[PDB]
Design a protein around this ligand. Structure first.
Ligand code: CL
Ligand code: CL
Length: 355
C-alpha cells in the first residue's frame, strides 16, 4: 500500500511539508493503560518484544489514540547482543543484564554477526507485520543502538553509572575493544539493513552513552563507528532514500562532527536550543527534537506554548523556515504522564506549524 502520510520522511530529507511532523520517544509505554494491560497479560518485556504479533500490537497502540506522524518499532537495542549469545535477562525492576558479559579477548573472539532472519527473526517479522497493519497510514521507524552504546552494555553486563570496565578496556586493551566494536558495527549495519528490507522506512541509531567519553575517546571509539554505519549502510538515493537519524544526549559538542557523517538527521534533547543546533550543524541535516518531556506535566496552555517555542526557535535558526524539523521529545515519556496532555501536544504541533 502506498504511504499516505510521508510528512516524517520529507522533513527528514529537508523537503517542504504542510505542517511539522511529530512522533514521541516511548510513545508505546506504561503511560498508556492498554500497554500496561498487554504487559500484564504477556508477562514480561521480552514476552512482548520477542513475539511479533504483540510487538505489533504495542507499536500500534499510541496510533489508536493520537494522530502521530510515525510508528516506531517496539523492541530494545539489546536484541543484537542477545542474539550473539550473551543471554539478556531482566530482574523485576532492576534493568537489563547479561549472563555472559564480554570481559576478555576470548569472549570478544566468540562474537559473530547474527543471521538476521533466523536469530533476529522476531524483529524482522514484527517489522513486516507492522508495515502490513499500518497499510500506508504513516511510516515505520526501525532502530538500533550505536556500536559504542551496545559495547557498553556488553562489557558491563548491564547498565552502569560510570562505565569503568569498558573505559579501562579502551585504555589497556584498545585493540581488543576495536575488534569488539568492529563486529558490533557489522552487526548494526546488517540489522538496520534487514529492518529496511523488511519494511522500515526510516532508521534511527541511539548513541545513548556516547557522552561519557572525552573528545579524543569519542572520536576513536564511537564516532568512528557511526561514520562506518553511515558509509556502509545502503539506503537508496535522493528523494527516495531511507533516512538515517543519529540520536545522542547532552552531546551538543559533537553536533558539528555528527552533521558531517552523511546521516540525514540528528535527534537531540533540550540541553541546547534548536537554533544553536542549526548553527552548529550548518544546515547539513534535519533536526529531530527537542522538548523536555516533563513539559507534559504542565497545563495544556503551557504545553501548547512550549510546542510553539520549540517550533519557533527552530525556525529562527533556519532563516525563518520551519522545514527540515521533526518534532520530538528529548527523552521518553514517563509512566505517570497523562494521555490527554499527549493529545494536546500533538494537536498543538500540527496547528502552530501550519505552512
Ligand atoms: Cl521510542
Ligand atoms: Cl514505560
Amino acid at each position: 500500500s502506498p504511504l499516505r502520510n510521508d510528512r516524517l520522511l520529507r522533513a527528514l530529507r529537508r523537503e517542504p511539508v504542510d505542517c511539522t511532523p511529530v512522533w514521541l520517544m516511548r510513545q508505546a509505554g506504561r503511560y498508556l493503560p492498554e500497554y500496561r494491560a498487554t504487559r500484564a497479560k504477556a508477562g514480561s518485556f521480552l514476552a512482548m518484544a520477542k513475539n511479533p504479533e504483540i510487538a505489533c500490537e504495542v507499536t500500534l497502540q499510541p496510533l489508536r489514540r493520537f494522530p502521530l506522524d510515525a510508528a516506531i518499532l517496539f523492541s530494545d537495542i539489546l536484541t543484537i547482543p542477545d542474539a550473539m549469545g550473551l543471554e539478556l535477562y531482566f530482574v523485576e525492576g532492576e534493568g537489563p543484564k547479561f549472563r555472559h558479559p564480554v570481559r576478555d579477548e576470548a569472549a570478544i573472539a566468540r562474537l559473530a554477526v547474527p543471521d538476521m532472519e533466523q536469530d533476529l527473526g522476531y524483529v524482522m517479522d514484527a517489522v513486516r507485520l507492522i508495515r502490513r497493519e499500518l497499510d500506508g497510514q504513516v511510516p515505520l521507524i526501525g532502530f538500533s543502538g550505536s556500536p559504542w552504546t551496545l559495547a557498553c552494555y556488553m562489557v558491563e553486563g548491564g547498565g552502569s553509572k560510570d562505565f569503568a570496565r569498558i573505559k579501562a578496556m579502551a585504555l589497556n586493551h584498545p585493540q581488543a575493544l576495536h575488534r569488539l566494536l568492529e563486529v558490533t558495527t557489522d552487526a548494526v549495519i546488517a540489522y538496520l539493513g534487514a529492518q529496511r528490507a523488511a519494511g522500515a522506512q526510516a532508521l534511527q541509531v541511539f548513541d545513548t552513552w556516547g557522552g561519557v567519553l572525552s573528545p579524543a575517546m569519542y572520536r576513536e571509539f564511537s564516532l568512528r563507528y557511526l561514520q562506518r554505519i553511515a558509509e556502509g549502510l545502503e539506503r537508496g538515493e535522493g528523494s527516495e532514500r531511507t533516512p538515517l537519524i543519529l540520536f545522542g544526549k547532552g552531546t551538543g559538542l559533537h553536533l558539528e562532527a555528527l552533521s558531517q557523517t552523511g546521516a540525514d538527521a540528528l535527534g537531540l534533547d533540550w540541553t541546547l536550543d534548536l537554533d544553536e543546533a542549526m548553527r552548529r550543524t550548518g544546515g547539513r541535516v534535519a533536526l529531530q527534537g527537542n522538548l523536555d518531556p516533563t513539559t507534559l506535566y504542565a497545563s495544556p496552555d503551557a504545553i501548547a506554548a512550549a510546542a510553539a517555542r520549540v517550533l519557533d526557535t527552530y525556525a529562527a535558526g533556519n532563516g525563518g523556515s520551519r522545514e527540515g524539523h521533526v518534532f520530538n521529545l528529548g527523552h521518553g515519556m514517563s509512566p505517570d504522564m497523562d494521555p490527554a496532555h499527549v493529545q494536546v501536544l500533538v494537536d498543538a504541533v500540527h496547528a502552530h506549524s501550519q505552512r
